[PDB]
Design a protein around this ligand. Structure first.
Ligand code: FAD
Ligand code: FAD
Lengths: 457, 457
């Protein structure tokens, strides 16, 4: 690099720089998806909005490929690059909560767990994903859903404004009253339009929630899934009920006989009065014979911390995901036969139901696509051994292929590293080309292209 | 203030200053103990170690009373002052966790829930308190105990070094090899010796833990508490079992007749193989009939997020606590009789058992006193109404007074605002006077006096 520019950048940067020669480089460059092994020229750990301005201008002037990293959970591996700069936000994880306002301001590098901790100090909360180690940054920019979404919508449905650094180094506010074209785009358009350094959210009061997790044999697979899809079609918003097909974990609540064998793990909660929730959950817990039933009344922060129970975190991941408008009987049996071939104990075939509040938002209100498709399926292969990559990748691909016509769209936040060309299909032509128009205005050179990328014009 | 001193301060300060005229003054100055209503001259929200150096030097030159704020959980209200400066660390909450080193470097404003999130990304953990909103900063400086402590010790038993800003504005490292007198003092000596801007910890791998919570009627109060005190005397380190006497929360797992009436809430976990945990917990669950039994195998981060059942944040608190060397039958009847008079649904009479790894550290190895007393009781009055302060406070004082002589020492982190004169008894003469000698060296002017204070010399 040009020393003057490198020196210039350094003069303006108060964070920590990690070079390939430094000691925390190999670990700083690893992301959650360990199949992605890349070596940046530079890792810039920003500590403030001025730091990110300096890093973005440096990358622009040097012509370095820009990776932005929040929590490192990209299933496509977008948060690390070969030979470019990582704009790493993981040290910007402060959150200010006003109890009086029911508002949270969170930095771009926050983890969900920290966010939930800070808001639950006041018994407040807003929708986010179910794994607490996930970064707020990439989750919100792609939409973000979890236990609270059927009641309160997507994370973007509770976003009130952002502070964002654009590719030319300027700091902008985006809200419904300031740069509203940009505010439209960041609500579902990913990292395409700049580095969000602050997210502001509306918060809701969420007290203890009745929660249940249990396991069904695949022998009862057809009636469980059918009961689930039938019930969710008319369920109240307060009910969330998700199915995860997987090998049974060797946990004491399940008989040793079931351990390591394909099962349906069913998790459900009631967002509302726990007494009503006890009644609602028990009415849906017995479509199959429930094994290893755990029922609890949990602080919301404890529900957020629950997924998923297990001795390790898988090192290698490959996901194939899409939406469904209906889950047909043919589609049910296909999921069940593919679940029966699960090989790794970390792999999950996820069946999620959204709808509710998410569905109620007008389709063009944000850049998030496919609100009106209630089902999400995610074949989430996960494993350890690098020499078994092909078998696990193959399980997720062929499951996806067997379902293909039932599936439409795609959640940008579940895309794998080979799915760069799924961007148009995911958004649809209308949203895609409106996003292209916002990109030509705020990122005309496509400085931000490590994402489900939207080329300008 | 003197405008050239202030102008120098603000020039060196990259954080936020909050003045009494500022919007968010009133909220920034509130702490968790809402009986403490104080108005600082200035709240300085630090964002880095250089910020803390600037604020500390500004306070010293200005002669402002210094309050240090981490998580705001001071039961004595030490984290806000009338007329001084709050050096507020709550925006410094970044955590670096290295999976290879099993190390966590945590800034001095971290909350436990953020720390546990960050370490559990690698299935790692280290002992801390049981409520995730507590500040790491004040908790560790007093010792720190929770679910992992009988197995792995106090938080200070896993602290390997700190970065600390002393009253003269210098930044020091303290460890077993650098400034070891100071390193002894900060491990149990509170905020007396400076502002800790970073804590480094050893981490341990902690996977799923078998957990149980249940409630006993006070009718069976005597046999439950006797079984508890008899069993813990010889329990393995892996078992933690705590009792919380309280009004039963109106939760669906409990019969409506028990709602709002005094009960023993018993929580236990096994830090180890969940199948062995299931065996161990069931052997201790049946000294009385368990009502509202919840059993679960939880990620450790979810165990940390669990406390407490009901999840309501009380506005007003008053605590009386001490250690016990033995729990006699007469002390047991006293605890049961006072619990029967609990008036507020947020109030708890806590019965904890430490021992284990805490008790195997030599007594003089740190400044934390009374490792050899295994029992802790905490009469924690908590309520909403400011016009009823006297009743709630009276319940706590009277309970403590009833216990009398069974109680010795006292955990500095459970002191109330009227307990400044308990510092000597809490530490004991030998530790107190050694701490004074460390105080004479590192804080001779007693600039840091909002704490269980140790005067120099
Ligand atoms: C185990 C696991 C569980 C999950 N659970 C769910 C869930 O329940 N619900 C759900 O909706 N999703 C979930 N996700 C997906 C998650 O939403 C996406 O992986 C998301 O992009 C991760 O965000 P991140 O900041 O952690 O990842 P990163 O790898 O850091 O970044 C992902 C993308 O966001 C961009 N980006 C990140 N931060 C910023 C920022 N501040 N400004 C601009 N761009 C940014 C990056 O450039 C990249 O394109 C899960 C993922 C994993 C791995
Ligand atoms: C609801 C609740 C549950 C609790 N649970 C437990 C538990 O399970 N186990 C346990 O051991 N304790 C527990 N505690 C007590 C806790 O350890 C003390 O309240 C502790 O002082 C909290 O630290 P803090 O930073 O949050 O509070 P603060 O009010 O911000 O600070 C308390 C003291 O520490 C000083 N201080 C704080 N941070 C720093 C720093 N970085 N450098 C120098 N000084 C600092 C302050 O000056 C003050 O004297 C609990 C408290 C509450 C209120």
């Amino acid at each position: 690099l040009d020393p003057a520019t490198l020196a210039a950048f350094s003069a303006a940067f108060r964070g920590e720089l990690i070079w390939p020669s430094d000691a925390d480089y190999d670990e700083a460059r690893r992301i959650w998806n360990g199949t992605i092994d890349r070596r940046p020229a530079l890792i810039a750990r920003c500590t403030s909005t001025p730091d990110v301005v300096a890093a973005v201008s440096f990358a622009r002037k040097s012509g370095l490929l820009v990776a932005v990293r929040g929590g490192g959970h990209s299933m496509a591996g977008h948060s690390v690059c070969d030979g470019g700069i990582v704009i790493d936000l993981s040290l910007m994880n402060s959150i200010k909560v006003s109890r009086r306002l029911r508002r949270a301001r969170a930095q771009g590098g926050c983890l969900l767990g920290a966010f939930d901790t800070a808001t639950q100090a006041h018994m407040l909360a807003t929708p986010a994903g179910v794994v607490s180690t996930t970064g707020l940054g990439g989750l919100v920019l792609g939409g973000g859903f979890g236990w609270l979404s059927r009641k309160y919508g997507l994370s973007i449905d509770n976003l009130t404004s952002v502070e964002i650094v654009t590719a030319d180094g300027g700091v902008l506010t985006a809200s419904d009253t300031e740069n509203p074209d940009l505010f439209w785009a960041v609500r579902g358009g990913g990292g395409n339009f700049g580095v969000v350094t602050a997210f502001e959210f509306d918060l809701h009061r969420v007290g203890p929630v009745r929660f249940a997790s249990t396991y069904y044999s695949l022998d009862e697979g057809p009636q469980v899934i059918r009961a689930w899809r039938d019930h969710m079609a008319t369920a109240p918003d307060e009910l969330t009920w998700a199915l995860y097909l997987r090998l049974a974990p060797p946990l004491p609540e399940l008989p040793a006989d079931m351990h390591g064998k394909p099962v349906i793990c069913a998790m459900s909660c009631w967002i509302g009065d726990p007494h009503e929730g006890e009644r609602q959950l028990e009415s849906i817990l017995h479509a199959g014979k429930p094994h290893g039933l755990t029922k609890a009344t949990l602080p919301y922060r404890a529900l957020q911390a629950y997924s998923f129970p297990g001795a390790v975190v898988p090192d290698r991941i490959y996901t194939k995901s899409g939406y469904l408008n209906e889950l047909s009987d043919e589609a049910t049996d296909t999921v069940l036969e593919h679940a029966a071939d699960i090989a790794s104990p970390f792999t999950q075939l996820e069946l999620l139901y959204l709808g509710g509040a998410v569905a109620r938002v007008p389709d063009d209100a944000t850049a998030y696509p496919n609100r009106q498709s209630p089902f999400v399926t995610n074949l989430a292969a996960a494993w350890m051994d690098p020499t078994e990559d092909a078998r696990h990748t193959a399980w997720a691909r062929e499951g996806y292929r067997a379902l293909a016509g039932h599936l439409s769209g795609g959640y940008v936040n579940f895309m794998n590293p080979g799915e760069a060309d799924r961007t148009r299909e995911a958004y649809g032509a209308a949203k895609f080309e409106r996003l292209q128009g916002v990109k030509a205005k705020y990122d005309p050179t496509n400085l931000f292209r490590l994402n489900q990328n939207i080329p300008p014009s």
